[PDB]
Amino acid sequence: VLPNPGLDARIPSLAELETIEQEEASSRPKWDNKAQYMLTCLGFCVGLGNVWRFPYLCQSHGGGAFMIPFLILLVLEGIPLLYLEFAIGQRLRRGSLGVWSSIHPALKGLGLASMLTSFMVGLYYNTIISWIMWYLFNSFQEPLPWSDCPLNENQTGYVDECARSSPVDYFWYRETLNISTSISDSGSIQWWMLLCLACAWSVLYMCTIRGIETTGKAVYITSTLPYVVLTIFLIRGLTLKGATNGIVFLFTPNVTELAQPDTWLDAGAQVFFSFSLAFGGLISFSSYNSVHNNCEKDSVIVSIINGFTSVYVAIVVYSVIGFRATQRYDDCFSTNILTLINGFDLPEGNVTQENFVDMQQRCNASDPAAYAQLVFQTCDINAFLSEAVEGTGLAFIVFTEAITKMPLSPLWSVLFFIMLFCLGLSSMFGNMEGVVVPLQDLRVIPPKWPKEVLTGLICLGTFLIGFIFTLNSGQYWLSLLDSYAGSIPLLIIAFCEMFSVVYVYGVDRFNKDIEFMIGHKPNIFWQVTWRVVSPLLMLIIFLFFFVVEVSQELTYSIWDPGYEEFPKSQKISYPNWVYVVVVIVAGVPSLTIPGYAIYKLIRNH
């Protein structure tokens, strides 16, 4: 509908597509088998970003009050983009940068914003992978290192930090992070973290050395292992003592928070992180398929798996959440029993959870003075299930503590960190695709040089940038990417992709194109979502996102041993300078879209 002259010149002819598959055998990569492409899409739409983020956001809002908005926006904003990206890649036979540049020369900014976004989400997820590897390397020890505390110079006093907190909390914050007390206290590089980061980048390079020539064989183990191990852990999680307690707890959501715009905004932005939309890897990967490949059926199959896996992983987390809360309730309970048995010297086993409050009174009446000094605890289990976990605690605090309480704890630790490592890797193949393909399409390195050279330099460059997260104050920096700074760009790119395919390229041409590729015009579901539903929803979510999420003062959680109510949470304000960083990390990619477009319409004059 917007005037676009010269489009037919830039893009391949519809008749030329019939004479391209058997004559472009060289120069362009090809999937060996449909299975390789489907396993790549599985690993990028159900890697981390689905399996890592979703469960955290479930327990940070409400077990079931978040899945409802998530599954609504999956259908109405996610499936439509997923199909659109698959189809446009398959049609125009190019990556994100090739695709948007050919639909209109002013939209090369859309492709540069996807490469930067992909860069930034790769930098984030590979730090998470370096932590996962640290924990996998410490998982070959009968007593897992996070099961006990270190002693003092007297070798008779437990470390005060561990004593005040826990063996796990201390292994995370002190033995892994060696965390400082604020983002301003940079400290120095944790050498053992640096070795883990090098390991993460180096394994990624081994798998991505010749793009899909190498990543397509990697996905046979990397997109199949996670799903079997997540099935095993589902069974073990369900067989837990309190497992069902958490399972019932995520399927009884409070509806008072289903009316909270933050639940809608997080679900909004999670749909684009879950599917790896607006990164540009999906467009590149779909561009290597046959022109007669059914991209509609693929988008639907991937989607169904994405939604089903989101709800499945929420069951595996909450079974473990339920297990932790129940072993707390019991513990706390067993100590309230032990206070009056030690105060009134009652026979052990006489006072039980069944007969406790009665005994409290029977004893209070007997000796109220001898009952007053008996400090007790008020611990209902609904207060334990609804105890939110800040940061990466669900992985390195809740799941790690629960694995130590299981028998053969070292075999469950290795399976858990191998599952997460493969998910990380599968996701990292897409994010690397979304940085490598654009740099190939910017012709910045000598064409003569093998891709191996370009892939290697991206791995070294990003490895060196990731030294900031190896600092004493690294987690604090990684938590800035967890801010709205990590999401605004994704919402802007997704909108612009939808808008440009429907109004700059034309939805009518796009329907004739799909009709050519798969044999039928997309039905009225796709039409409504592509022309109104998806676009409007994306705009609204972007508008309200700034109304509250962006407006709210950026705060973060510090781990200070020297703090009153120490093992409890002290959120502070980030310095003024930090906010500038959030602006550049989110603004540059977003502003690349218009910035490049305005550059192109003042070079024309």
Partner: peptide, 29 residues
């Protein structure tokens, strides 16, 4: 260190894989 020795083994096999893979490409002529 157990973590260190496991790390070393993983690194070794990974770098060996990388070397084999790059050499495999050199072999491809």
């Amino acid at each position: 260190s157990i973590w260190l020795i496991v790390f070393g083994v993983v690194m070794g096999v990974i770098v060996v894989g990388i070397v084999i893979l790059i050499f495999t490409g050199i072999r491809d002529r």
